[PDB]
Unconditional design. Structure first.
Length: 381
């Protein structure tokens, strides 16, 4: 039978967080730790825009934030190739499959802004895929996502500049659908059997049913308890995703746990209701699901007075709920599943119990029988 993969998002941290103690200095050690925990897939940023401009250039990147522990809290320098192929080879050696995505990290020359048409964006990914195929590593790639949380302007400013009227998260608007469709057609002229998609965080999962998005081979949907019911949890806590100031986190310290423990069942029901709803939509549309950003709080970190226990509780619930539906082919336990989140990474048995459940969950027959689109991803698991 085909087994789902237990996946973790290593985003742009795999390449960037390699200063002393940053977490990803020794890829063999962290990939051994990852396998020991039972994960067998990773979602990473491929930096296609940088590879397509100059693959061996040492690029100076501007930070996205200084309040979070993903990637760099200040300026940093990266060289994408051969580092990507090196990293992919270490994955292959350990039978870890890799999903590619991008957050289109801003270098000082902001090269991603040039990708202002779906054809340009596709040409850029066609280049990165050929760089991977040069070292015979394409079979290690599980899927290709053209943009994290499409079409948010933080990640896709090259799109948001041209179509300011679509707005954050509205992937289902006509301009977005058209762009996505044209880009994926260009991809399939070269890689017809590779699963392609764009990943979304928009909370109204019923849009998958209301619009023609059949051109997506899978759905990678980000789901957090904290964002449910119009972001009720965070409105209560006082968290606004501030990227450079500490005040939002101070509210997380003061209120997050309190707000949750006041009525854990209520929060848990918001989470599981969304997960079940997503599975329903996926089953109707006959598409496999992957979730790499989940399941409790969106932002968290090792910090004084931040406890991980209640967050792990929500992650465990999310994981087990998703896995049981049969619609997920790739399931993450959380978006803190890496060596820089000591509080999340450390309890090896907690991971092993969940990855065991994920990897032994049977898939729905809507995916395994008479489904050529789904078979593109299933054959790679």
């Amino acid at each position: 039978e085909i087994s789902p993969r237990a996946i973790t998002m290593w985003d742009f941290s795999w390449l960037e967080r390699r200063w002393p103690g940053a977490g990803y200095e020794d890829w063999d050690q962290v990939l051994d730790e990852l396998s020991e925990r039972g994960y067998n897939a990773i979602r990473i940023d491929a930096y296609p825009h940088l590879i397509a401009e100059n693959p061996m250039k040492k690029w100076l990147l501007k930070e996205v934030w200084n309040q979070q522990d993903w990637g760099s809290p200040d300026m940093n320098e990266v060289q994408v190739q051969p580092n990507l192929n090196l990293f992919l080879s270490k994955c292959k050696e350990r039978d870890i499959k890799v999903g590619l995505s991008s957050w289109y990290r801003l270098d000082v020359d902001e090269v991603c802004l040039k990708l202002d048409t779906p054809e340009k964006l596709a040409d850029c990914w066609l280049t990165i895929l050929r760089s991977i195929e040069e070292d015979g590593l394409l079979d290690t790639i599980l899927y290709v996502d053209l943009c994290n949380e499409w079409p948010g302007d933080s990640w896709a400013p090259f799109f948001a500049k041209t179509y300011p009227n679509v707005g954050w998260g509205n992937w289902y608007k006509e301009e977005s659908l058209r762009w996505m469709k044209t880009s994926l057609e260009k991809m399939r002229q070269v890689y017809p059997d590779m699963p392609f998609l764009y990943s979304f965080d928009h909370g109204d999962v019923k849009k998958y049913e209301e619009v023609d998005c059949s051109f997506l081979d899978l759905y990678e949907h980000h789901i957090w308890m904290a964002q449910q019911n119009g972001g009720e949890f965070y409105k209560l806590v006082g968290y606004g995703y501030n990227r450079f100031l500490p005040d939002d986190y101070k509210n997380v310290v003061k209120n997050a746990e309190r707000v949750y423990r006041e009525r854990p069942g209520y929060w848990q029901k918001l989470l599981t209701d969304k997960i079940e709803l997503m599975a329903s939509v996926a089953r109707k549309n006959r598409r496999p699901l992957v979730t790499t950003e989940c399941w409790g709080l969106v932002d968290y970190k090792d910090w004084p007075l931040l406890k991980w226990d209640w967050v792990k509780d929500l992650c465990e619930l999310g994981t087990i709920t998703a896995a049981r539906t049969g619609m997920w082919v790739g399931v993450a336990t959380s978006n803190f599943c890496g060596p820089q989140f000591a509080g999340m990474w450390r309890d090896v048995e907690w991971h092993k119990r969940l990855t065991s459940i994920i990897r032994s969950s049977p898939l729905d027959e809507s995916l395994t029988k008479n489904n050529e689109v789904a078979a593109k991803l299933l054959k790679r698991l």
